[PDB]
Every structure is written in structure tokens, then in C-alpha cells.
Design a protein around this ligand. Structure first.
Ligand code: CL
Lengths: 665, 662
């Protein structure tokens, strides 16, 4: 219909006279914490059910067909997960058995404390790369070589194959324990707002750079070259230059096999993803390619006749739990925090995706606690940080998964692949394991295709993407994330420091005020100059407010008053011998302000005082109640700056000005 | 007075269909690159006037309270300038001969270039150790170490002199020139917006521990306690516990001398503040306590008969300008960059602290080139860096002082002290001049009284003030301002992430919408609620905006959807076998205080509309004035069903829309 109102001009004081405010609630800190301390059985049962979600979905099972669905999804996910674990084990500088270890125990630990249903907790390429990088930093290769072997000229300081793996495994276990402790601290203390700073473009650029580094590392492993574990600044660029310079020490057979399996896996994966309408179950190309590689590699002696690179270092058994080597937390706290936050971000992303796909809820703090307990249990059994791979989770969701029982069954596959089966994978070339990782990088590599899309969108979001992607390549990968969050916060500060001020005017015979730089036929008040200033004024943008006012009024309240004083002394000397023309008022439409930052209210009062000397009134239009309640406490309403200066709506100020001009010439 | 604003309800598409837009000017730089200053001489005269900040206040000062006020203030800050030059030179591992030059030459070039009063340019204590650190690193202590002198057993490895200090001064002179040219090149690209990030609590919380740092640094010289040099973390605490641990070897004669002078100087200072209406000109007790100290010392020989500590090393005569070594600028470039940043930080910090007591707000771009060329002019003469001490700027402002001319007359006092008045201030006990800085230090020590004042005004800046103070004590003055600057920006992003969201409600028989948590006797439309986030929806407050909705509507759109389909599948199988929703119709987000949006915000805001659409509950919007609206349609917010009709110009138009719809 229509919109018509009629009311007196309640500016600021005509509103608080006949409006009984709501008294604040009594704090009573003692009784508040006493009442907050729950003691009834209802809250106890609630927190028990929340902390241990295993007792929720288990009694209400649908065993009839869920048993078959879970067993088939479990065998499929177990095969895929043991393959991905034995592949990512190379990224953690640990033998091939510890990937299967980190694929078995975290599942058992997440089964009794997790809150998801489709998340396959296991290894991850980015997390494994970060773990390997921090292990190489804390334990380089040239720190274990033992002089033995009667060398030609000097002492035979060859490789330390053996006890080196034990030190690397102990370091990885300590890192996993520290990451679990950090995650438990973040979860229990309810400090979960720290992961909100990981924006979508930021995490996209970080995943792109991490996928590029994973590609570099896996190409190094495939070519069978020997680098010097370049870590720190420009690590990826330096190791890529070294690879390009050390091409001569390659293996033609290993390179050919790697390229062949890369092409085959990529083609089969693209065919299965595109033509899904003909094949419902995704073909496990990884499983069949690993089987055929183990078959061919055992037919001919690829180790002796072709000098290939195989694992052949499987003990095929378990080991008693070992206590973590405490003392290395101070030199790895930042790395553990980075690994924990990136793992939690990836886990929450995968969980939200596969939860909005299946329409169920996933709690954040519960996932934090579950992953913390999982990493703590993994630290006692020599495992690395566990996460949920996008490719590994997709298999369990595509084959059909309802509860975590499929994951529990997925551990049984790794179980049987640990105890007895597994030594058949002895002649498996390391190139095949190092190739499937590259084939799975297609998802994070296509993330580069969003920069042309984000650039047409809000440009500041695209700059964060490019900055995070580039900076996470120059100064390593762990320190690259810290340079991204700080840059994102600085970009947020820049958007509130440089607002979009306009010349707000009124449409003819209306009450709504729109900008003047975007419309043509708008009427402005005679003498009055309206100004709207978003991005609330704080200590960093108050000079911007001064400059904006000086630009929108045409003059400066300082220079005009100085010229008036200079002309005044000329008057008092001539009688003894014997600028601000169009501007009538200034209506500040500060309606988009949230905080006031008293450091800024000081300058606001200074502006109001300076404009009074030049006889130019400066009013306010749409200030909020919580802002006036703060300006009152900050010492702003003196005997001269009353409340009549402020207003409720933008049109009320113009109406009051017109009435004052009509009633007072 | 009522007013008739009868107007049909206008949505976004209903307001742009009859009005017209304005073609935005792209303003390409291919043809507009010569629009700043092409031929107009007015802009050329303006930049020259701002480049030379001497034709502004010098042809404008009033000699009424200028001559006698600044002269007595100049001798006060000039005396302190001599003491710091004689003290900081020894800490910089260089011979104590050029400290007076660092207080004479930089003031001359800064008197004409630079508009910042109540600042005495010269050496700074924490910046002098940084110079001595990079000098001792790139210059061995023993250059030749001549093994001659017929020692006890082996050759007497006497430390080489003459050429040693000459190389140290040469290295220090090159460092000042390198910091100067780097200070100037920063002013080239006009990066002067960094001064806007220094808030009053930031500079206030910074110049209170520095006042405590200058207190303990003058306390170790007033007690003659030989302590080691400490910098970095826990620098102030380690020096404080060292004095209390090494308090034994304290000169009793010098202790009772300084303690008697610190009392008599502050007593007459507050006496002048009480009787300021009786005596027009403030009596310069600084020059009074100085002449009486040299009188009682020269007439009693407090050094060779009492061991009180005197200067006894005042040099004489200027030195010709010496050319630096260009071949060594490359090595200093890696370390002088960090020193150059912290130098300008302290330089402007002592400028903003006095901007709160007098309306003398300064600009960063002009001060960056002012201290820049001054250190360049400090070069070629073997001077120090062009910083400004916290003790000299306190004694100048508290004891009168109107313009920067007090620094000019101060150099004249040092100019005559080096050529003709060297033997005059010889027996100075180094206590009446090292304790006078403590008297004028009350101007910054009393700045801790704003903590209960700022706490009652705004809790955020009160925490910022105390945070920078306690952090500058632990992490030193170097990393104190940097850690406080990041903490200051962190409070800005936190206050914009967690706003004061409240549900709004109209007043009876009117169209004014205010918060319902702060008022009574309000009314809410049956089935329609209002929510005002009052903050931009960026990547940080994405879930916070979601938690703002589900806590205001009572339910959660996620949990009511899965239970709805669960009951739907429950009743579906019962048909084959055989057979908590709130009445709120819609919600209008009063997101009118938003200033910017991001890709994460527009995506999450779209998911909210799609989520409530599945629950048969509509979601409407409010005033997206000019930018937040055009940014949404650019990020692909409207694809097939979501249109700009769901938006509204005013909050009451949204209420009237849902009213006549049902
Ligand atoms: Cl993956």
C-alpha cells in the first residue's frame, strides 16, 4: 500500500522524556557463577551425551541394510585409506608402516568421541608435508651420518639408514602429541573463534600453495634424486632449481612408470567423475593400479636389473606403545599450532560439506575435542597428525556411508594389512605411491581458476588470495599462514579506515536520502550540506573524517577561523587609526557507526567546537543508542553541547533546520 | 511539528525503475596523469610552503611571552642536552667528543625544516645502544693490538689507540648518513599514514614506561652503579634488579647530594604552579641549581677529595667536515633499516603525547623528511642520529616553552660552551643535571591517572593503555610499540567482529525503531521480528551473524530442517505400513550499519536466505544504501528466484510490506 507517518520532531531529548528505559539485569557475579554452575541430573546427562556422542547414534541403528552398506563402504574406505596412508608416509619421513598406523588408531579414537558420520579420519597430503618439513628442520639428514665403510679418501660418512628412522618417528610422535594438546586446549577452553579468521580465499590460496609444494616434493621422490632438504625461506624455489640442476641423476624406468601411472590414474579419475551417469560406484583406480604395479614389479627383478626404488622395509607387525620425548615443545610450538589450525580448518570444511550434503549437524568444539583426543592417542603409538582427505572421504560417501561403523570396519582392513598381509607390497615401487598423491592434487590445482572470478567480485578478496598463495611460497609454508592471517586482518582494518563517504541528498518530496554521486535529479537543502560516514570513526580514520568534512564543505574550519582572526585584528587597528558563504549547517549522517573509540570522540568534540566559532552548526542524524550511551560516558555532553544537536532520523534534522530558518531569520 | 511524508512503499527495483543513475568516471591514468600540478603556480607555491615549515610560525610569533620564556627554557634543555651528549657518546663505544655536535647541528637544520614544538632533537638512550651494537659487531675491539710495552711475561698487547676511535667515529658517521638517506627516501613515496595508527592510549601507554625507562637509566648514574648493558626482552627488569643487587658501591656523598636536589627542585616547581599569578615569569630553577652545584664543587673538590663524580672531560673546538666511506654503506644497510623505523617511532611518539594538551596535531609526511634531512645534515660532520630524548622534551615543555626557538637558543648555549665556556661547567657533579630530568618527569608520571578515567569512559582503550605499558616494560621500548600497535589494530577487528546486536522494535503509533533490550512498553509485530547486527558481515563474523539469528529467533534453521525431514520420512513409512516451530512468519534483517562485504559474506548471506526458504519462513532486508547493494549483485547474489524486491529502503517499509501481504 502506502507509507505515511506524522509525529513531532523527536531529535534526542524529546524521545528520552516519555520513554521508560529498561534497567540492566543485576550482574551479581557470585550468584551468577553459582547459578551457572549446573548440578541437576539433566545437565549432567546432557554434557555426557555431548562429550561422548557415541551413545547417541548407536542405540538408534538401522542394522537391516545399514550393516551391508557399512561393510561394503568399510572395505572400500579401508583399501583407499591404507593406500593413501602408505603413500603419504613418504611425506612424513617415516617408513611405510606408520602411515597404516596413523590410518588405524585415529579411527578407533574418533569412533568413541567423534560427532561426524562420513568423515574418514586419516592422513592428509598438506599435513604430512608440514610434518615432514618440520621434521627436516628439527632433524636434518646431515646430522645422522656415521663415518663407517672405509671410504676412498676421507671417512665413509654414508647415509644413516636405520636409527635415523627411529629419531624421525619419535619427533613425529612428539609433534602429534603437541598438536593434540593444542587442539584439546582450544576445544576445552571454548576458544574456537580463532579459526574464524581463516577466510575462504585465504584457505584456498594456502591449499593451492600447499598442493604446489606437494607436487614438487612428489616429483622429487618420483625422479629418485637426492636434494639437501632445503627448509626455511625460498625452500620450494631452491629445491625446484636443485631438481632442474640434478636431472642427470634420475631413473629412466622410474620416471617412465611414474608418468604412465600418472596419465592412467588421471584419465580414469576424469572418466569416472564425468561419466557418473553410467557407473554408480567409483572405480578404485588406485587399488587396481597398485595391484598391477606390485604384480609387474615382482615378475622381473626391478630392484637389481632396473635399479628402481622400492620400500622393502616392512616389519609386518605391531609395537608396544612408547612414551613421547618431552622437551621439544618450545622449539615446535608455532609449527604445532599451524598444523593444528590447518588440520581443523580442513576437517571443518569437509564436515560441513558432507553434512549439508546429507543434512545433519556437526559441532565445532566437539570436532576439536575429538581430533585432540585422536592425536593424543596417536602420539602414544608413533603416528602423525590425522585429518580427513577430500578424496578419501569422497569414496566413503559415494559407496554409501551412514555411520562411523564403516570407518570402524575401514580400520579392520588396515588391521589385516598390518598384522599379516602387507609384506606382499615389498617390491612395490615408491614412484607409484608418490604418483597417486599427484593425481589427487587435481582438486586443489583447479582452485587457481577462481582468481578471474574473484577479481570481477570484491577485489580485496582476490588480493588476499594472491597474497596468501604467493607469500606461502616465498617464506616457507608454516610461516606463510601467519603472514596471511595478519594480512587479512590488515585488509579488514583498511576497509574500516577508508570508508565510502558521499554527498547524501533528498529525492523531491520524499523522506529517504540517497547519494548524490549516483543520481542526477536530486535536490539538496539550501545551505545545509549532508554527509554520511560509514566505517565508525576510530583512532586511525579520524583524520580521514577531518579530510572528508573539509572536502564536503569546501573549506577548513581551521583556516577560515584563522583568516577571520587575521581580519579581526585589521579591524581593531583601523578604528584606532581614526569562505563560509554557502554552508549554513552540517548534518552528519553517522548511522553506520558501531564503536566510537573515545580517542575519536575527543576529535569529534573538537570539530563541533571549531565549527561553532565559524558559526556553522554540525548536527548528527542517525546515531545509535549504544553509541550515545558511550559518548555520554566519554565526556561529550558539556554545558554547551546538549542533546538538541543530535537527531533520530536524517529527515528530522533537515526539518528542524528548515523550521528554525523559517522561525528565525 | 508533524510532517506529511506520504509516499508509496519503495523497494530496490521499485525505486530504480523511475529514477536514473550517473555514469561513473573511470578516471584512467593514461590521460589524467598530468592533473596534479601541470602549470598552475598556486599548487607549486603550496608544496614549497609545506616543505619549509619555517614561514608559518616564525613570522607569526608574539614576543609578549616569547623572549624571556624560551631563553630560560633553552638553557634548561641545553644543559640536559650537554649531559646526554657526554653520556650517550660513551655508551656508543665512540670517544665522548661529538655529543655536543649531535645537539648543535641537527637543531639548526630542524629549526627551519620541521613543525613540531616541544621536541629537542638529539641522541636517545635506547637508540644509542643500537648504534653501539652494530658498531661493535662490524668493527673488532682490537684493530692492531700492538704487542709492545715490555710486559711481565709475554709482549704487552696494548690496545691500539688513535686509529681505533677514528675508525669508530667514521663508522658511526657513515651509519648516521645511511639512516638519514633512508629516512628521506621514506618521505619520497609519502608514506605518512602510519602516524594515524598511533592512538592516544598507544602513545600514552608508550611514554609512561619510557618515562620509567629513563628513570632507571638516570637512577644508575645518580647512584654511580656500574651495571651491564641489557637490551631486547626483560631489559628494564634486568637493569632494575642489577641496581638493587649492586647498591653497595654507591657514593654516599653523591647520593645525599642528588636526593637533596631532587627535593628542592620539585618543591619550587609546584610552588611556581601555586604562585603562578603572583610571579609572571616562571623562575628558571634549572640554571639556579646548576650554578650553585658548580660553586660548592669547585670550592670543595668533590672529585679528588670526595669521589662524587664530575664531567672533567669537556672538549673544545669544532672539527672540519669529513667525507664518509661509501664502500661501507652496503653492510650497514641490513641493520640500519630496523634502527631507522624505531627512530621515527620514538620521534613522533613524543610528539603525539603533547598533542593531547595543546591543539598542535602534526602530520607524518612532513616530520619524516624533517628528521630525515636533519640526519643527512648531521652527516658529513661526525654527529649522531636525529632522534629526540624523552627527558629533554619534558624539561622543555614543563618549564615554559612556546615554539621551537627554545631549541635554537639551546644550541647557542652549547655553542658557547664548546668554544668559550668549557672550563665553566667542569666540576658539575653530574647529579643536579641528571636529577632535574626527574622533576620535569612528573608531567608523564602523572599520566597514569587516566587509567581510572579511561576505564569509566571505554573499557577497550583502557586495556590498550595498560597493555602497551606492561609490554614495553618486558619487551623493551623497541618491541613495546610494535606489540602495542598490533594489539591496537587487534582491538579494532575484535570490536567489529563482536558487535552489540539487539532486536529492534517500533514505538506505538510511530515509525521509530529502537532496541527492545534498552526500553519498555514497546510492541513487536505478530510473526515479524527485526534484527540489527550493526557490523559488516566479513569472513570473521560469518558464524557470529548466524549465531545472532538463531539466538534471536529462538530456534535454529538447521536443526528444524533435519527434524522436519526425519518426521516426514517417519510419517511416510507409516503410510505404506498403515495409519517446536515458532509462529514467526518472517524476519527482517536491519543490516543498515554495514559498511563493506566480502565473498564469504555474500555467500553465507545467500545460504541464510536459502536455508530459511526451505522452512517456509521468509527473510527480508533493510537499507543497503549505495555500496553494499551494488557489491552483492556483482558477486552473483541474484541468480533465479532471489531478487531485489526482498530489499527495502526504510525499516518501516518492510513492516508495512509484511502487514498488507497477510
Ligand atoms: Cl587428498
Amino acid at each position: 500500500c502506502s507509507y505515511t507517518v506524522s509525529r513531532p520532531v523527536y531529535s534526542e531529548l524529546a524521545f528520552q522524556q516519555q520513554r521508560e528505559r529498561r534497567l540492566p539485569e543485576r550482574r551479581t557475579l557470585r550468584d551468577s557463577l553459582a547459578r551457572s554452575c549446573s548440578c541437576s541430573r539433566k545437565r549432567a546427562f546432557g554434557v555426557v551425551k555431548t562429550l561422548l556422542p557415541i551413545l547417541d547414534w548407536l542405540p538408534k541403528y538401522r542394522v537391516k541394510e545399514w550393516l551391508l552398506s557399512d561393510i561394503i563402504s568399510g572395505v572400500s574406505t579401508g583399501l583407499v585409506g591404507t593406500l593413501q596412508g602408505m603413500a603419504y608416509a613418504l611425506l612424513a619421513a617415516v617408513p611405510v608402516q606408520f602411515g597404516l598406523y596413523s590410518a588405524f588408531f585415529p579411527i578407533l579414537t574418533y569412533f568413541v568421541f567423534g560427532t561426524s558420520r562420513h568423515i574418514s579420519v586419516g592422513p592428509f597430503p598438506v599435513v604430512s608435508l608440514m610434518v615432514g618439513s618440520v621434521v627436516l628442520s628439527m632433524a636434518p639428514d646431515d646430522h645422522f651420518l656415521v663415518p663407517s665403510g672405509n671410504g676412498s679418501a676421507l671417512n665413509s660418512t654414508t647415509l644413516d639408514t636405520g636409527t635415523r628412522d627411529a629419531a624421525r618417528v619419535l619427533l613425529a610422535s612428539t609433534l602429534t602429541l603437541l598438536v593434540g594438546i593444542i587442539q584439546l586446549v582450544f576445544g576445552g577452553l571454548q576458544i574456537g573463534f580463532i579459526v574464524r579468521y581463516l577466510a575462504d580465499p585465504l584457505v584456498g590460496g594456502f591449499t593451492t600453495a600447499a598442493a604446489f609444494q606437494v607436487l614438487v616434493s612428489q616429483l622429487k621422490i618420483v625422479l629418485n634424486v637426492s636434494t639437501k632438504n632445503y627448509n626455511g625461506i625460498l625452500s620450494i624455489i631452491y629445491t625446484l632449481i636443485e631438481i632442474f640442476q640434478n636431472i642427470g641423476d634420475t631413473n629412466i624406468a622410474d620416471f617412465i612408470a611414474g608418468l604412465l601411472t600418472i596419465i592412467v590414474c588421471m584419465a580414469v579419475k576424469e572418466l569416472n567423475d564425468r561419466f557418473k551417469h553410467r557407473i554408480p560406484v567409483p572405480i578404485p583406480i588406485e587399488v587396481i593400479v597398485t595391484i598391477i604395479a606390485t604384480a609387474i614389479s615382482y615378475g622381473a627383478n626391478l630392484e637389481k636389473n632396473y635399479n628402481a626404488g622400492i620400500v622393502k622395509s616392512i616389519p609386518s607387525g605391531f609395537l608396544p606403545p612408547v612414551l613421547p620425548s618431552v622437551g621439544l615443545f618450545s622449539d615446535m610450538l608455532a609449527a604445532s599450532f599451524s598444523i593444528a589450525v590447518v588440520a581443523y580448518a580442513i576437517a571443518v570444511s569437509v564436515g560441513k560439506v558432507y553434512a549439508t550434503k546429507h543434512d545433519y549437524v556437526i559441532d565445532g568444539n566437539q570436532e576439536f575435542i575429538a581430533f585432540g583426543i585422536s592425536n593424543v592417542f596417536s602420539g602414544f603409538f608413533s603416528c602423525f597428525v590425522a585429518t580427513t582427505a577430500l578424496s578419501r572421504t569422497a569414496v566413503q560417501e559415494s559407496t554409501g556411508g551412514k555411520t562411523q561403523v564403516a570407518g570402524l570396519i575401514s580400520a579392520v582392513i588396515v588391521m589385516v594389512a598390518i598384522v599379516a598381509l602387507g609384506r606382499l607390497l615389498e617390491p612395490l615401487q615408491k614412484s607409484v605411491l608418490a604418483a597417486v598423491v599427484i593425481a589427487n592434487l587435481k582438486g586443489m590445482f583447479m582452485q587457481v581458476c577462481d582468481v578471474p572470478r574473484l577479481w570481477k567480485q570484491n577485489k580485496t578478496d582476490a588480493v588476499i588470495w594472491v597474497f596468501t598463495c604467493i607469500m606461502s611460497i616465498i617464506l616457507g609454508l608454516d610461516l606463510g599462514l601467519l603472514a596471511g592471517l595478519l594480512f587479512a586482518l590488515l585488509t579488514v582494518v583498511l576497509r574500516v579506515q577508508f570508508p565510502s563517504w558521499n554527498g547524501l541528498g533528498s529525492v523531491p518530496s520524499t523522506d529517504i536520502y540517497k547519494s548524490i554521486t549516483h543520481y542526477k535529479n536530486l535536490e539538496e537543502p539550501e545551505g545545509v550540506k549532508i554527509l554520511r560516514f560509514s566505517s565508525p570513526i576510530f583512532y586511525g580514520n579520524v583524520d580521514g573524517f577531518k579530510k572528508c568534512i573539509n572536502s564536503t564543505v569546501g573549506f577548513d574550519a581551521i583556516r577560515v577561523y584563522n583568516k577571520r582572526l587575521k581580519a579581526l585584528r585589521r579591524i581593531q587597528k583601523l578604528i584606532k587609526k581614526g569562505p563560509k558563504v554557502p554552508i549554513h549547517s552540517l548534518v552528519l549522517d553517522c548511522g553506520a557507526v558501531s564503536f566510537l573509540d573515545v580517542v575519536g570522540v575527543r576529535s569529534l568534540r573538537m570539530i563541533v567546537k571549531e565549527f561553532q566559532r565559524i558559526d556553522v552548526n554540525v548536527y548528527f542524524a542517525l546515531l545509535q543508542d549504544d553509541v550515545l550511551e558511550k559518548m555520554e560516558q566519554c565526556g561529550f555532553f558539556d554545558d554547551n553541547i546538549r542533546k538538541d544537536r543530535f537527531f533520530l532520523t536524517v529527515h528530522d534534522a533537515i526539518l528542524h533546520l528548515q523550521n528554525q530558518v523559517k522561525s528565525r531569520e
